[PDB]
Design a protein around this ligand. Structure first.
Ligand SMILES: C[C@@H]1C[C@H]2[C@@H]3CCC4=CC(=O)C=C[C@]4(C)[C@@]3(F)[C@@H](O)C[C@]2(C)[C@@]1(O)C(=O)CO
Ligand SMILES: CCCCCCCCCCCCCC(=O)O
Length: 581
């Protein structure tokens, strides 16, 4: 109470306290060296130990924001590396942290970590605390809004992988599959949390509560409304704190919520038992990623209370938010086969009916057939997910990505090529993950992951706005975000980008790139072909990229690579224009 840092240190323990502060500094200061950050963590850990022993000691009565924010401004390489970030230090709290958070880089362009099993299993023994410590540093700086306590968990997933594989003869065959899967889990985790932080920023905590009521109601249909409301309230406060960089307060409140859920597990979900017999980080993660519980047999029809009841306006008038919260809980728990956006869309439609009906002469007659408005809202995304999986299953991942790059480049040609390539590549991998699932699990998978990919586009677009359409879709409404983007079409009055030959000129440098980086260069060229020829068919673009593809493979196989590229390049560049007419 007297000393907050004393409280956090005592509650969290040294390793996790240090760990979260290393992650904290790594997110705020993303280009600072590892060894520099290690000292800053030690200097804070040092001071926290003094306060826990004697809370009356100087500076111990200050808030963690102040104490952390003060330590950030004493960084010697602050003005040199980060520039404008040093201007924030002149401002006072709470405006100083708000200033720091804006200067977090969502796209830091950092070296793509190669999994080198010979180098790392050896480095795991050379300096182990440096190893697991550096892993936290590297993930944190590439993902400045990554869920702090969730990153500590991934570091222990990292630890366990090396201790299991390094002993074995073939270190590569064991480690690579395990590490490859972890990179996929980290990108998804980063994406999930960024949408929580984005929702706070753009739509406030009411939007974050609504989303969570829907998701946890699906996860815990056995749980009553007062439990879901309690868990949502506590969990919203947790994500608010983490998203504002208060990782220590975030981590402590998260541990309290883990304890609560597990002390009341029988009346929340039968699927939590395994989770609650685990250490804090394993327990917390297991709760967050818990599979949905079996549906209760004893639930009545919704219409009885939400269409038929004659005192619905009375319920609505006195307690607007609570009664809508009640509707979302009841609709969500029955429909785990629905996306969270679809549930929030339905709930927004219900509110809209009551605002208009309780004003009219005969309200009961008005909101009698409110459930008829939902059937078309359900069918639209069902139709979209079918067409995309039908396309994916036919043409496979790479060609599905290319089809989506063309789709989104036409929707927004003003958006930077790297941004368009990223969402096309992301949404293609969603095809791989989601389409191989049963129909009931497929819609939520696709549309939930789509929301994460659209948020990424909105985050990158917010930093550097180019389109008013994209701004409107990104800022209007979170529930209506997917519909808004789905509706986007090629601007009739779009001025084609003028032809630059250098943009479509390849060299021998491409041959030495890893396959992923090789595809990005070709997929970057595809986006540019669309920007130059926006009225070209997807089938014309598929063919021209196939020629570029064949041209690269040929010259990268040639005895004289640079000689091949010099001769063949301009010929293909010239014919490609005529082909896209
Ligand atoms: C869970 C409840 C119910 C929520 C509402 C459910 C219906 C709805 C759907 C939307 O697409 C946008 C806003 C609303 C209309 C809503 F999401 C927000 O207003 C926030 C809300 C009241 C809530 O989140 C609270 O804040 C409760 O106090
Ligand atoms: C509106 C987005 C719907 C689908 C998102 C599913 C993936 C999980 C991300 C969690 C982010 C929650 C968003 C929020 O805080 O409102």
């Amino acid at each position: 109470h007297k000393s907050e840092i004393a409280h956090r240190f005592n509650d969290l323990g040294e390793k996790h306290f240090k760990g979260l502060v290393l992650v904290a500094f790594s997110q705020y200061l993303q280009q600072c060296p590892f060894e520099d950050h290690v000292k800053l963590v030690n200097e804070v850990t040092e001071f926290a130990k003094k306060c826990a022993a004697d809370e009356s000691a100087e500076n111990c009565d200050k808030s963690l924001h102040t104490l952390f924010g003060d330590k950030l401004c004493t960084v010697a390489t602050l003005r040199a590396t980060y520039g404008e970030l040093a201007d924030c230090c002149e401002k006072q709290e709470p405006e100083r942290n708000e200033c720091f958070l804006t200067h977090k880089d969502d796209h830091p362009n950092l070296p793509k970590l190669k999994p080198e099993p010979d180098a790392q299993c050896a480095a795991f023994q050379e300096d182990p605390d440096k190893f697991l410590g550096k892993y936290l540093y590297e993930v944190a700086r590439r993902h400045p809004y990554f869920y702090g306590p969730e990153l500590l968990f991934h570091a222990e997933e990292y630890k366990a992988d090396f201790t299991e594989c390094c002993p074995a003869d073939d270190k590569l065959a064991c480690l690579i599959p395990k590490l490859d899967a972890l990179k996929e889990r980290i990108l998804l985790s980063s994406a999930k949390e960024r949408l929580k932080c984005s929702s706070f920023q753009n739509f406030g905590e009411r939007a974050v509560k609504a989303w969570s009521v829907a998701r946890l109601s699906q996860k815990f249909p056995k749980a009553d409304f007062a439990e879901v409301s309690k868990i949502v309230t506590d969990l919203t406060k947790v994500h608010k704190e983490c998203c504002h960089g208060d990782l220590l307060e975030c981590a402590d409140d998260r541990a309290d919520l883990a304890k609560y859920i597990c002390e009341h597990q029988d009346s929340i979900s039968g699927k939590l038992k395994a989770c609650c017999d685990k250490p804090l980080l394993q327990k917390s993660h297991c709760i967050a990623e818990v599979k949905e519980d079996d549906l209760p047999s004893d639930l009545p029809a919704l219409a009885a209370d939400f269409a038929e009841d004659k005192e619905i306006c009375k319920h609505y008038k006195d307690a607007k938010d609570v009664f809508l919260g009640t509707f979302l809980y009841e609709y969500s728990r029955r429909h785990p086969d629905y996306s969270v956006s679809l549930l929030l869309r339905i709930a927004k439609t219900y509110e809209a009916t009551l605002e208009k009906c309780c004003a009219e002469a005969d309200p009961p007659a008005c909101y009698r057939t409110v459930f008829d408005q939902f059937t078309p809202l359900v069918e639209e995304p069902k139709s979209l997910v079918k067409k995309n999986c039908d396309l994916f299953e036919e043409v496979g991942e790479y060609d599905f990505q290319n089809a989506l790059i063309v789709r989104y480049t036409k929707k927004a040609p003003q958006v930077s090529t790297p941004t368009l390539v990223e969402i096309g590549r992301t949404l293609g991998k969603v095809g791989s993950r989601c389409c191989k699932l049963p129909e009931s699990e497929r819609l939520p998978c696709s549309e939930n992951h789509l929301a994460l990919a659209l948020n990424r586009l909105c985050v990158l677009h917010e930093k550097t706005p180019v389109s008013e359409k994209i701004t409107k879709c990104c800022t209007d409404s979170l529930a209506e975000r997917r519909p808004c983007f789905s509706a986007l079409e090629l601007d009739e009055g779009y001025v084609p980008k003028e032809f630059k030959a250098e943009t479509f000129t390849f060299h021998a440098d491409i041959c030495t790139l890893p396959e992923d980086e090789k595809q990005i260069k070709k997929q970057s060229a595809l986006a540019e072909l669309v920007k130059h020829k926006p009225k070209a068919t997807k089938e014309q673009l598929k063919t021209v990229l196939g020629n570029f593809s064949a041209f690269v493979a040929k010259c990268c196989g040639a005895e004289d690579k640079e000689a091949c590229f010099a001769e063949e390049g301009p010929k293909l560049v010239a014919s490609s224009q005529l082909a896209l007419a």
